[PDB]
Amino acid sequence: KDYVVIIGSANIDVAGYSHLNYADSNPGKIKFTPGGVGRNIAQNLALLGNKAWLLSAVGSDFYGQSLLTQTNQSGVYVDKCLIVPGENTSSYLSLLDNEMLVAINDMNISNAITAEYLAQHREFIQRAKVIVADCNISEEALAWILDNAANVPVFVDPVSAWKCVKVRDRLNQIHTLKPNRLEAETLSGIALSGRDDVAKVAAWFHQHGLNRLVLSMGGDGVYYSDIRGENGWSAPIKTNVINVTGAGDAMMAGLASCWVDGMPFAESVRFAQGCSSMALSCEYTNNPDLSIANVISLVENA
Amino acid sequence: KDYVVIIGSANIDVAGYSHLNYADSNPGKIKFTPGGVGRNIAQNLALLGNKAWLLSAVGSDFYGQSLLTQTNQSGVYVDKCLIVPGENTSSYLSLLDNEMLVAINDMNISNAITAEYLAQHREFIQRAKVIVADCNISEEALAWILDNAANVPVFVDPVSAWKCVKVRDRLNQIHTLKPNRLEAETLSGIALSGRDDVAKVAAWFHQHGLNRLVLSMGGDGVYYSDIRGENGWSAPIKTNVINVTGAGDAMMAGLASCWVDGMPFAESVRFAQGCSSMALSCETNNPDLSIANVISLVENA
Ligand SMILES: Nc1ccn([C@@H]2O[C@H](CO)[C@@H](O)[C@H]2O)c(=O)n1
Numbered sequence: 001k002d003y004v005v006i007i008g009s010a011n012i013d014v015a016g017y018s019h020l021n022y023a024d025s026n027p028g029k030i031k032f033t034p035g036g037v038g039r040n041i042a043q044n045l046a047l048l049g050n051k052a053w054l055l056s057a058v059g060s061d062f063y064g065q066s067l068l069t070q071t072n073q074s075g076v077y078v079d080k081c082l083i084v085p086g087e088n089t090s091s092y093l094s095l096l097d098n099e100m101l102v103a104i105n106d107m108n109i110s111n112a113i114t115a116e117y118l119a120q121h122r123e124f125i126q127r128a129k130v131i132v133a134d135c136n137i138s139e140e141a142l143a144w145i146l147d148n149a150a151n152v153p154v155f156v157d158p159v160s161a162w163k164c165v166k167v168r169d170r171l172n173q174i175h176t177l178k179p180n181r182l183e184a185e186t187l188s189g190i191a192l193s194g195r196d197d198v199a200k201v202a203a204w205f206h207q208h209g210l211n212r213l214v215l216s217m218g219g220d221g222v223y224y225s226d227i228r229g230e231n232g233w234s235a236p237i238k239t240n241v242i243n244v245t246g247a248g249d250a251m252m253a254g255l256a257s258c259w260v261d262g263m264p265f266a267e268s269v270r271f272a273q274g275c276s277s278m279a280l281s282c283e284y285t286n287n288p289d290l291s292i293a294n295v296i297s298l299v300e301n302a
Numbered sequence: 303k304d305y306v307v308i309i310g311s312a313n314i315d316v317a318g319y320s321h322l323n324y325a326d327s328n329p330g331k332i333k334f335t336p337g338g339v340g341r342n343i344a345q346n347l348a349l350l351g352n353k354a355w356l357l358s359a360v361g362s363d364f365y366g367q368s369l370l371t372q373t374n375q376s377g378v379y380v381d382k383c384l385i386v387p388g389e390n391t392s393s394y395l396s397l398l399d400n401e402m403l404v405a406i407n408d409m410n411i412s413n414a415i416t417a418e419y420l421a422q423h424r425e426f427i428q429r430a431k432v433i434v435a436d437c438n439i440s441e442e443a444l445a446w447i448l449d450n451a452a453n454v455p456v457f458v459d460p461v462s463a464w465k466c467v468k469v470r471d472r473l474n475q476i477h478t479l480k481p482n483r484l485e486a487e488t489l490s491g492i493a494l495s496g497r498d499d500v501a502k503v504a505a506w507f508h509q510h511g512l513n514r515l516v517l518s519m520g521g522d523g524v525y526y527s528d529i530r531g532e533n534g535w536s537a538p539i540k541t542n543v544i545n546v547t548g549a550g551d552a553m554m555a556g557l558a559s560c561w562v563d564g565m566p567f568a569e570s571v572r573f574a575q576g577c578s579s580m581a582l583s584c585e586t587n588n589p590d591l592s593i594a595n596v597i598s599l600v601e602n603a
């Protein structure tokens with residue numbers, strides 16, 4: 001009867017690529033995928049075996065409902081997602097070829113994921129084993145979550161260099177933060193020129209109250225640091241990359257899930273890297289063969 | 303108990319525009335609309351009051367189903383549209399700004415609208431009052447429709463200069479064709495430099511067996527020609543244009559509907575221009591397209 005609550009954005013990623021001249025309806029291939037940091041994390045959690053509830057917002061349009069339906073039939077409990085009237089479901093348009101040419105994001109219904117909304121589900125939220133939130137939601141909403149978590153661990157996905165900032169004044173209310181290099185630099189105000197700077201950055205995070213830091217450094221790997229003193233590097237699982245999208249989402253799901261499973265920090269980080277690799281090796285934004293079994297198999301195969 | 307059958311493509315048009323440049327997550331606005339020539343025509347027919355059945359193809363994906371649902375309580379009977387497994391629903395991606403920049407069409411699922419499929423609905427098709435087909439479907443499928451229409455008038459939308467050509471060898475099996483300038487030039491092999499050339503083009507169409515020609519000339523207007531001798535011009539309803547998509551779709555719906563209503567050719571053409579205008583004045587289908595509101599637009603001349 002243990003459930004996980006994910007609070008974030010649910011999107012539709014539309015990817016189009018040609019077989020290219022401008023001012024012409026050029027024949028190509030278009031894919032509709034389910035996306036959104038929060039939604040993706042919820043789905044990866046469900047594929048990891050946890051009972052996951054999504055608290056998101058989608059429009060009164062029909063395509064929103066089919067986003068919810070697809071997600072529900074991925075295993076996610078979507079029956080508390082807010083269907084918002086009059087406004088259209090958010091989306092991530094993306095023009096590729098072979099290398100993305102351009103991308104557009106329409107994500108303002110995220111501001112409908114309000115404090116009043118979450119307050120309507122206060123007790124349900126406060127009786128989860130862990131709450132996962134992304135920084136796509138408004139500063140007020142994130143503030144409400146962190147203010148009303150009732151000692152339920154909040155895992156936060158910073159999303160981008162632009163949207164991580166709302167987290168800076170609230171690191172003492174966050175159980176685990178997973179920033180990349182740029183996001184960590186943006187938050188700390190300290191340059192991460194190289195691997196010699198992670199200690200100083202992490203020390204900045206810990207002095208500002210962050211319980212746990214999971215710092216993805218790209219090729220450098222993952223540097224993890226606990227305010228109680230434990231820290232270390234984990235070198236990347238070397239992989240066959242085909243997509244890069246859904247990497248961090250899978251890693252976040254891995255961290256939250258492993259936490260719920262009672263796993264220690266370091267091994268949870270390694271496992272999360274396993275998840276991220278599995279995501280990196282799959283045509284879609286989420287890998288439907290993400291499961292405890294084959295990430296574990298990817299990890300013992302070291 | 304009179305129904306109309308529309309056989310064509312059902313798409314999802316996704317339009318995105320920013321507010322600006324490249325290699326970056328650019329904040330903007332994205333719109334999902336229901337589209338596809340056939341589907342649009344069916345919807346306009348339903349808004350005109352006719353009982354319209356759509357014979358189209360959509361993927362096993364969920365967004366296909368939401369296209370179908372949206373279309374259904376737009377008034378269209380979609381319960382015979384083919385849900386095709388394994389393949390994804392066709393779509394029209396379009397990158398704009400303030401002026402259309404680039405566009406992609408993924409429409410290979412149109413090839414699932416097969417002869418076999420339509421043959422599974424032979425009798426239902428053959429007892430409609432009129433069949434509307436677009437040239438997005440395969441040459442074989444259009445050939446099957448025209449070969450098995452059982453004297454039910456087939457109205458054909460040429461769609462584009464690229465796809466109108468499959469109609470060239472079969473103008474004698476078509477009740478009404480609605481080409482634009484470029485499509486007419488492409489079909490006839492005769493240049494339409496100016497308004498003095500419509501006669502020779504139309505004569506070419508009639509000599510190759512076309513019963514009725516409805517030729518949209520843009521600013522020049524609409525030239526209509528009947529193989530039995532009636533022909534004429536109709537000047538445009540002058541309008542407040544905000545988008546242009548769904549114009550020809552609305553006109554085709556107007557022609558088919560007016561035909562079913564027993565209206566004469568010319569008056570049906572004028573009415574159809576009214577419909578196309580109503581479409582031109584609404585951010586692909588106008589939900590206030592109706593006999594009332596078109597007649598009001600036309601009597602207001
Ligand atoms: N500001 C943004 C940008 C992107 N996304 C979603 O993130 C997914 C890939 O991680 C993509 O599926 C995309 O929809 C998001 O939630 N917020």
Ligand SMILES: Nc1ccn([C@@H]2O[C@H](CO)[C@@H](O)[C@H]2O)c(=O)n1
Binds near residue numbers: 315340407461462548
């Ligand atoms: N080859 C094509 C190109 C476009 N379309 C559909 O036509 C509508 C505008 O008339 C748009 O909604 C678009 O989806 C089509 O059915 N086939």
